């Protein structure tokens, strides 16, 4: 299972 | 950065005339990901060709496997034709069933 | 008995028209099991191994939400990094992300990974301690300061040590029949004269899984690298891998040469010799 999107760059 | 593809052309199974098999063209080590890869039968593009989903190596370079079902014969010659922004002309690698 | 789970994301901008192309793939060891392609018709995370197809609709809904949201995050980030690097809007650029976990034979956490690239070079990466970031340049330093303020490493670490390990374990019991199997290499040697006085011996390894393997030549029991050639390990397309190693020898002296094959599926290495 994937990790949800992290913080924008 | 940009990196030129490495190319291997080979069969899935030991090649034997008249026995169905798969022809593979494995392209690796390239960047960027845009690439054109064709399998050729006696110099003509084969229509039914599939490829793996894009992935990459530790060094960020991409790799793909292109493949088609075929039945080798004594007469027929096969090859893989690659174009990439790093090549000035398409690169053609002949299938050698010893390699 | 050690195992890994990895996800690989690639986003490529296309300034002539529309959103970037986004591709995600997931692997257990050397076996792909899921994909997402923003240009495909389904607009869903899709199975790529028979053993994951048993997961229910809620599985697919959540995985699809995550990768669609990631595609938008990458779209935003392509814009931000173009700005950090003072690049034009006209060119295409690439963001790549890899992350995942390794477990030991006991199924417990060994190592976690999270690393990101821009145009095929390192951008920012989580250190092995999962507590700090390595930023390659002053653009990535901006991202690092933002990620520190957001406690992004803590969030990544909790996933890598928790959910990553737990779902890897579940997949290994779901796909056990293949994922927990090792296929040792099918090995043989061929012989090709070159001239009246020299020949090539080629040592073949076929049908093996996982992909890691070592092929080495010896002459009279001592390692030999002169006059040898090796191909990179390559996929057969049926879930197995191939490799060969060759050496040029004086004709008549073939029996001095041995090929030595190491693979996880072999309790003891194999030795081959031309007869």
Short mmCIF file of C-alpha atoms in Angstrom, two decimals:
data_model
loop_
_atom_site.label_atom_id
_atom_site.label_comp_id
_atom_site.label_asym_id
_atom_site.label_seq_id
_atom_site.Cartn_x
_atom_site.Cartn_y
_atom_site.Cartn_z
CA UNK A 1 0.00 0.00 0.00
CA UNK A 2 1.10 3.51 -0.96
CA UNK A 3 1.98 6.43 1.30
CA UNK A 4 -0.34 9.47 0.73
CA UNK A 5 1.25 12.46 -1.01
CA UNK A 6 3.82 14.27 1.13
CA UNK A 7 4.23 18.02 1.60
CA UNK A 8 4.75 20.11 -1.53
CA UNK A 9 8.33 20.97 -2.45
CA UNK B 1 21.11 15.20 -17.17
CA UNK B 2 20.93 12.91 -20.29
CA UNK B 3 21.97 9.29 -20.72
CA UNK B 4 21.96 7.06 -23.87
CA UNK B 5 20.14 3.70 -23.86
CA UNK B 6 21.82 0.36 -23.53
CA UNK B 7 20.10 -2.28 -25.71
CA UNK B 8 19.84 -6.09 -25.57
CA UNK B 9 17.85 -8.15 -28.12
CA UNK B 10 17.11 -11.76 -27.17
CA UNK B 11 14.42 -14.44 -26.85
CA UNK B 12 12.40 -15.39 -23.83
CA UNK B 13 13.10 -19.12 -24.35
CA UNK B 14 15.85 -21.02 -26.16
CA UNK B 15 15.35 -20.27 -29.82
CA UNK B 16 14.36 -23.22 -32.06
CA UNK B 17 13.03 -22.93 -35.60
CA UNK B 18 9.26 -23.47 -35.82
CA UNK B 19 8.68 -23.17 -32.08
CA UNK B 20 6.70 -20.21 -30.79
CA UNK B 21 8.58 -17.83 -28.51
CA UNK B 22 8.89 -14.17 -27.56
CA UNK B 23 11.31 -11.59 -28.98
CA UNK B 24 12.57 -9.10 -26.41
CA UNK B 25 14.25 -5.72 -26.66
CA UNK B 26 15.42 -4.55 -23.24
CA UNK B 27 16.38 -0.85 -23.13
CA UNK B 28 17.99 0.51 -19.99
CA UNK B 29 20.20 3.21 -18.53
CA UNK B 30 18.55 6.13 -20.39
CA UNK B 31 17.34 9.59 -19.44
CA UNK B 32 14.96 11.27 -20.22
CA UNK B 33 12.16 8.70 -20.45
CA UNK B 34 10.85 9.61 -23.92
CA UNK B 35 12.00 6.87 -26.28
CA UNK B 36 10.94 5.13 -29.46
CA UNK B 37 11.46 1.38 -29.71
CA UNK B 38 10.41 -0.85 -32.59
CA UNK B 39 10.91 -4.56 -33.28
CA UNK B 40 11.70 -5.29 -36.96
CA UNK B 41 11.09 -8.42 -39.03
CA UNK B 42 13.25 -8.38 -42.18
CA UNK B 43 13.57 -4.60 -41.68
CA UNK B 44 9.83 -3.88 -41.33
CA UNK B 45 8.12 -2.74 -38.16
CA UNK B 46 6.13 -5.33 -36.26
CA UNK B 47 2.69 -4.05 -35.37
CA UNK B 48 1.84 -6.00 -32.31
CA UNK B 49 4.46 -4.95 -29.75
CA UNK B 50 3.88 -4.42 -26.01
CA UNK B 51 6.08 -2.99 -23.29
CA UNK B 52 6.51 -3.01 -19.56
CA UNK B 53 5.46 -0.13 -17.33
CA UNK B 54 8.13 2.56 -16.92
CA UNK B 55 10.46 2.11 -13.97
CA UNK B 56 14.00 3.19 -13.03
CA UNK B 57 17.20 2.16 -11.33
CA UNK B 58 19.03 3.46 -8.30
CA UNK B 59 20.87 6.05 -10.43
CA UNK B 60 17.51 7.34 -11.74
CA UNK B 61 18.00 5.92 -15.23
CA UNK B 62 14.96 4.28 -16.87
CA UNK B 63 14.37 0.79 -18.18
CA UNK B 64 11.72 -0.86 -20.35
CA UNK B 65 11.12 -4.26 -21.91
CA UNK B 66 9.51 -4.35 -25.39
CA UNK B 67 8.25 -7.74 -26.57
CA UNK B 68 6.27 -9.62 -29.21
CA UNK B 69 5.31 -13.23 -29.85
CA UNK B 70 7.19 -14.78 -32.78
CA UNK B 71 8.17 -18.08 -34.34
CA UNK B 72 11.80 -18.13 -35.39
CA UNK B 73 12.77 -19.53 -38.77
CA UNK B 74 16.02 -20.02 -40.64
CA UNK B 75 15.24 -17.29 -43.14
CA UNK B 76 13.78 -14.49 -41.02
CA UNK B 77 15.97 -11.78 -39.49
CA UNK B 78 14.94 -9.75 -36.45
CA UNK B 79 16.19 -6.56 -34.87
CA UNK B 80 15.38 -3.73 -32.47
CA UNK B 81 15.35 -0.09 -33.57
CA UNK B 82 15.75 2.64 -30.89
CA UNK B 83 15.54 6.41 -31.10
CA UNK B 84 16.28 8.79 -28.23
CA UNK B 85 17.22 12.45 -27.88
CA UNK B 86 20.82 11.28 -27.22
CA UNK B 87 21.17 9.48 -30.59
CA UNK B 88 21.75 11.35 -33.85
CA UNK B 89 20.23 8.46 -35.80
CA UNK B 90 18.15 5.42 -34.85
CA UNK B 91 20.24 2.63 -33.37
CA UNK B 92 19.56 -0.85 -34.77
CA UNK B 93 20.65 -3.96 -32.87
CA UNK B 94 20.29 -7.30 -34.68
CA UNK B 95 19.01 -10.40 -32.89
CA UNK B 96 21.77 -13.03 -32.53
CA UNK B 97 20.33 -16.22 -30.98
CA UNK B 98 23.78 -16.96 -29.49
CA UNK B 99 23.58 -13.79 -27.26
CA UNK C 1 14.32 -14.95 3.37
CA UNK C 2 14.64 -11.12 3.23
CA UNK C 3 12.18 -9.04 1.23
CA UNK C 4 11.41 -5.51 0.00
CA UNK C 5 8.51 -3.34 -1.12
CA UNK C 6 9.09 -0.35 -3.40
CA UNK C 7 7.06 2.30 -5.21
CA UNK C 8 8.46 4.26 -8.14
CA UNK C 9 6.80 7.45 -9.45
CA UNK C 10 7.73 9.36 -12.63
CA UNK C 11 6.17 12.75 -13.64
CA UNK C 12 7.11 14.40 -16.94
CA UNK C 13 5.82 17.87 -17.88
CA UNK C 14 4.45 18.59 -21.35
CA UNK C 15 4.28 22.33 -21.95
CA UNK C 16 2.92 22.06 -25.50
CA UNK C 17 -0.40 21.10 -23.93
CA UNK C 18 -2.05 19.49 -20.78
CA UNK C 19 -1.03 17.96 -17.40
CA UNK C 20 2.23 16.06 -16.87
CA UNK C 21 2.38 12.32 -17.62
CA UNK C 22 2.41 10.41 -14.32
CA UNK C 23 3.35 6.75 -13.98
CA UNK C 24 3.47 4.81 -10.70
CA UNK C 25 4.60 1.21 -10.28
CA UNK C 26 4.77 -0.99 -7.17
CA UNK C 27 7.05 -3.97 -6.56
CA UNK C 28 7.52 -6.72 -4.02
CA UNK C 29 11.13 -7.85 -4.54
CA UNK C 30 11.55 -8.18 -8.35
CA UNK C 31 7.79 -8.69 -8.97
CA UNK C 32 5.62 -5.78 -10.13
CA UNK C 33 2.14 -5.90 -8.61
CA UNK C 34 0.37 -2.57 -9.30
CA UNK C 35 0.45 0.34 -11.76
CA UNK C 36 -1.11 3.73 -12.44
CA UNK C 37 -0.76 5.64 -15.69
CA UNK C 38 -2.44 9.06 -15.93
CA UNK C 39 -2.84 8.56 -19.73
CA UNK C 40 -4.59 5.18 -19.43
CA UNK C 41 -8.36 4.87 -19.71
CA UNK C 42 -9.22 3.43 -16.30
CA UNK C 43 -7.96 6.34 -14.17
CA UNK C 44 -7.51 3.68 -11.41
CA UNK C 45 -4.63 1.93 -9.70
CA UNK C 46 -4.56 -1.41 -11.54
CA UNK C 47 -3.41 -4.94 -10.57
CA UNK C 48 -0.33 -6.34 -12.33
CA UNK C 49 0.01 -9.65 -10.43
CA UNK C 50 -2.74 -12.27 -10.12
CA UNK C 51 -2.36 -12.45 -6.29
CA UNK C 52 -3.34 -8.80 -5.68
CA UNK C 53 -6.58 -9.09 -7.62
CA UNK C 54 -8.30 -10.56 -4.53
CA UNK C 55 -8.11 -7.21 -2.77
CA UNK C 56 -11.55 -5.56 -2.39
CA UNK C 57 -12.95 -2.32 -3.85
CA UNK C 58 -11.95 -0.34 -0.81
CA UNK C 59 -8.30 -1.30 -1.45
CA UNK C 60 -8.46 0.02 -4.99
CA UNK C 61 -10.35 3.18 -4.05
CA UNK C 62 -7.75 4.24 -1.47
CA UNK C 63 -4.75 3.42 -3.66
CA UNK C 64 -6.32 5.34 -6.55
CA UNK C 65 -7.00 8.36 -4.37
CA UNK C 66 -3.37 8.42 -3.26
CA UNK C 67 -1.81 8.22 -6.74
CA UNK C 68 -4.22 10.70 -8.30
CA UNK C 69 -3.40 13.16 -5.50
CA UNK C 70 0.34 12.44 -5.98
CA UNK C 71 0.04 13.26 -9.69
CA UNK C 72 -1.34 16.70 -8.71
CA UNK C 73 1.39 17.18 -6.08
CA UNK C 74 4.00 16.39 -8.74
CA UNK C 75 2.36 18.82 -11.15
CA UNK C 76 2.63 21.59 -8.56
CA UNK C 77 6.23 20.59 -7.70
CA UNK C 78 7.31 20.69 -11.38
CA UNK C 79 6.15 24.32 -11.39
CA UNK C 80 7.84 25.15 -8.10
CA UNK C 81 11.17 23.60 -9.07
CA UNK C 82 11.12 25.32 -12.51
CA UNK C 83 10.98 28.51 -10.48
CA UNK C 84 13.71 27.52 -8.03
CA UNK C 85 15.99 26.79 -10.98
CA UNK C 86 14.93 29.87 -13.01
CA UNK C 87 13.92 27.69 -15.96
CA UNK C 88 11.58 28.58 -18.80
CA UNK C 89 8.02 27.36 -19.13
CA UNK C 90 8.78 25.90 -22.56
CA UNK C 91 10.83 22.81 -21.72
CA UNK C 92 9.91 19.40 -20.38
CA UNK C 93 11.25 18.33 -16.98
CA UNK C 94 11.04 15.19 -14.81
CA UNK C 95 10.42 14.42 -11.15
CA UNK C 96 11.14 10.89 -9.89
CA UNK C 97 10.34 9.45 -6.43
CA UNK C 98 11.22 6.08 -4.91
CA UNK C 99 10.30 4.83 -1.43
CA UNK C 100 9.76 1.60 0.45
CA UNK C 101 10.99 -0.78 3.10
CA UNK C 102 13.17 -3.84 3.61
CA UNK C 103 12.40 -6.63 6.12
CA UNK C 104 14.45 -9.56 7.40
CA UNK C 105 13.48 -13.24 7.40
CA UNK C 106 11.63 -12.64 10.59
CA UNK C 107 9.48 -10.08 8.77
CA UNK C 108 10.65 -7.23 10.88
CA UNK C 109 11.77 -3.81 9.71
CA UNK C 110 15.37 -3.55 8.51
CA UNK C 111 15.61 -0.32 6.45
CA UNK C 112 13.42 2.38 4.92
CA UNK C 113 13.92 4.61 1.87
CA UNK C 114 12.54 7.84 0.44
CA UNK C 115 14.43 9.69 -2.32
CA UNK C 116 13.57 12.21 -5.00
CA UNK C 117 15.17 13.46 -8.21
CA UNK C 118 14.81 16.34 -10.66
CA UNK C 119 15.89 15.87 -14.29
CA UNK C 120 17.67 12.63 -13.42
CA UNK C 121 19.85 13.99 -10.58
CA UNK C 122 19.52 13.77 -6.82
CA UNK C 123 17.20 16.47 -5.35
CA UNK C 124 16.37 15.47 -1.75
CA UNK C 125 16.60 12.14 0.10
CA UNK C 126 15.73 10.83 3.58
CA UNK C 127 18.79 9.58 5.45
CA UNK C 128 18.95 5.98 6.73
CA UNK C 129 18.08 7.12 10.23
CA UNK C 130 14.70 8.36 8.82
CA UNK C 131 15.14 11.51 10.85
CA UNK C 132 17.08 13.88 8.54
CA UNK C 133 17.25 14.98 4.94
CA UNK C 134 20.10 15.32 2.40
CA UNK C 135 19.50 18.25 0.01
CA UNK C 136 21.83 18.27 -3.01
CA UNK C 137 21.72 22.00 -3.82
CA UNK C 138 20.23 25.34 -2.70
CA UNK C 139 16.91 24.62 -4.42
CA UNK C 140 16.53 21.39 -2.49
CA UNK C 141 17.59 23.32 0.64
CA UNK C 142 14.39 25.34 0.34
CA UNK C 143 12.37 22.15 0.21
CA UNK C 144 14.31 20.76 3.18
CA UNK C 145 13.48 23.77 5.33
CA UNK C 146 9.79 23.46 4.43
CA UNK C 147 9.79 19.70 5.09
CA UNK C 148 11.46 20.18 8.46
CA UNK C 149 8.73 22.68 9.47
CA UNK C 150 6.02 20.25 8.35
CA UNK C 151 7.62 17.23 10.18
CA UNK C 152 7.61 15.35 6.93
CA UNK C 153 10.37 12.97 8.02
CA UNK C 154 8.38 11.88 11.06
CA UNK C 155 5.41 11.14 8.81
CA UNK C 156 7.56 9.21 6.32
CA UNK C 157 9.21 7.24 9.15
CA UNK C 158 5.91 6.18 10.66
CA UNK C 159 4.80 4.79 7.28
CA UNK C 160 8.09 3.06 6.51
CA UNK C 161 8.25 1.29 9.91
CA UNK C 162 4.50 0.66 10.16
CA UNK C 163 2.15 0.34 7.19
CA UNK C 164 4.96 -0.47 4.73
CA UNK C 165 6.15 -3.41 6.80
CA UNK C 166 2.61 -4.60 7.62
CA UNK C 167 1.34 -4.60 3.99
CA UNK C 168 4.59 -6.15 2.69
CA UNK C 169 3.95 -8.99 5.17
CA UNK C 170 0.36 -9.34 4.00
CA UNK C 171 1.38 -9.50 0.36
CA UNK C 172 4.05 -12.09 1.08
CA UNK C 173 1.35 -14.37 2.55
CA UNK C 174 -1.26 -13.49 -0.27
CA UNK C 175 1.21 -14.14 -3.08
CA UNK C 176 3.24 -16.70 -1.12
CA UNK C 177 3.33 -19.35 -3.80
CA UNK C 178 5.44 -17.13 -6.05
CA UNK C 179 6.81 -14.36 -3.86
CA UNK C 180 8.32 -16.68 -1.26
CA UNK C 181 9.71 -19.07 -3.88
CA UNK C 182 13.28 -18.95 -5.19
CA UNK C 183 13.90 -20.30 -8.70
CA UNK C 184 17.57 -21.33 -9.04
CA UNK C 185 19.25 -20.73 -12.38
CA UNK C 186 19.11 -23.33 -15.15
CA UNK C 187 22.76 -23.38 -16.23
CA UNK C 188 24.68 -24.66 -19.29
CA UNK C 189 27.81 -23.85 -21.31
CA UNK C 190 28.22 -23.32 -25.06
CA UNK C 191 31.36 -23.41 -27.17
CA UNK C 192 32.07 -21.28 -30.30
CA UNK C 193 35.40 -21.41 -32.15
CA UNK C 194 36.73 -18.01 -33.16
CA UNK C 195 39.78 -19.04 -35.18
CA UNK C 196 41.88 -22.14 -35.58
CA UNK C 197 43.52 -21.39 -32.26
CA UNK C 198 40.86 -19.74 -30.04
CA UNK C 199 37.33 -20.29 -28.87
CA UNK C 200 34.60 -18.68 -26.80
CA UNK C 201 33.07 -20.46 -23.83
CA UNK C 202 29.75 -18.94 -22.75
CA UNK C 203 28.14 -19.74 -19.38
CA UNK C 204 24.37 -19.26 -19.34
CA UNK C 205 22.00 -18.75 -16.41
CA UNK C 206 18.27 -18.87 -17.29
CA UNK C 207 14.93 -18.94 -15.54
CA UNK C 208 16.08 -17.63 -12.19
CA UNK C 209 14.28 -15.56 -9.56
CA UNK C 210 15.07 -13.19 -7.83
CA UNK C 211 17.32 -11.25 -10.24
CA UNK C 212 20.46 -11.06 -8.06
CA UNK C 213 23.11 -13.50 -9.32
CA UNK C 214 26.88 -13.78 -9.70
CA UNK C 215 28.77 -15.52 -12.55
CA UNK C 216 32.56 -15.82 -12.29
CA UNK C 217 35.22 -17.57 -14.38
CA UNK C 218 38.29 -19.33 -13.02
CA UNK C 219 41.33 -20.78 -14.85
CA UNK C 220 43.02 -23.65 -13.00
CA UNK C 221 41.18 -22.54 -9.88
CA UNK C 222 42.13 -18.92 -9.88
CA UNK C 223 39.69 -16.07 -10.72
CA UNK C 224 40.06 -14.76 -14.27
CA UNK C 225 38.75 -11.39 -15.56
CA UNK C 226 41.03 -10.96 -18.59
CA UNK C 227 39.37 -11.88 -21.92
CA UNK C 228 35.91 -12.09 -20.38
CA UNK C 229 32.61 -10.49 -21.23
CA UNK C 230 29.37 -10.32 -19.21
CA UNK C 231 25.88 -9.04 -20.05
CA UNK C 232 23.68 -7.16 -17.62
CA UNK C 233 20.98 -9.26 -16.03
CA UNK C 234 17.84 -9.05 -18.14
CA UNK C 235 14.16 -9.94 -17.74
CA UNK C 236 12.85 -12.92 -19.71
CA UNK C 237 9.32 -11.43 -19.59
CA UNK C 238 7.73 -14.34 -17.70
CA UNK C 239 8.82 -13.32 -14.20
CA UNK C 240 12.31 -14.82 -14.47
CA UNK C 241 15.74 -13.42 -15.37
CA UNK C 242 18.72 -14.28 -17.60
CA UNK C 243 22.46 -13.64 -17.65
CA UNK C 244 25.60 -14.98 -19.34
CA UNK C 245 29.36 -14.66 -18.93
CA UNK C 246 31.95 -15.61 -21.59
CA UNK C 247 35.70 -16.15 -21.80
CA UNK C 248 38.07 -16.55 -24.80
CA UNK C 249 40.48 -19.47 -24.43
CA UNK C 250 43.16 -21.19 -26.44
CA UNK C 251 41.56 -24.14 -28.24
CA UNK C 252 42.48 -27.41 -26.50
CA UNK C 253 42.65 -25.74 -23.07
CA UNK C 254 38.89 -25.58 -22.44
CA UNK C 255 39.04 -27.94 -19.43
CA UNK C 256 41.13 -25.47 -17.41
CA UNK C 257 38.17 -23.09 -17.24
CA UNK C 258 35.25 -23.20 -14.80
CA UNK C 259 32.12 -21.04 -14.43
CA UNK C 260 30.92 -20.47 -10.87
CA UNK C 261 27.27 -19.51 -10.22
CA UNK C 262 25.97 -17.99 -6.99
CA UNK C 263 22.24 -17.42 -6.37
CA UNK C 264 19.93 -17.34 -3.30
CA UNK C 265 18.13 -20.46 -4.61
CA UNK C 266 21.38 -22.49 -4.63
CA UNK C 267 22.39 -23.99 -1.26
CA UNK C 268 25.91 -24.29 -2.66
CA UNK C 269 27.31 -22.51 -5.69
CA UNK C 270 27.36 -24.44 -8.94
CA UNK C 271 30.49 -25.14 -11.01
CA UNK C 272 30.37 -25.79 -14.78
CA UNK C 273 33.16 -27.03 -17.08
CA UNK C 274 33.24 -27.72 -20.84
CA UNK C 275 33.77 -31.43 -21.43
#
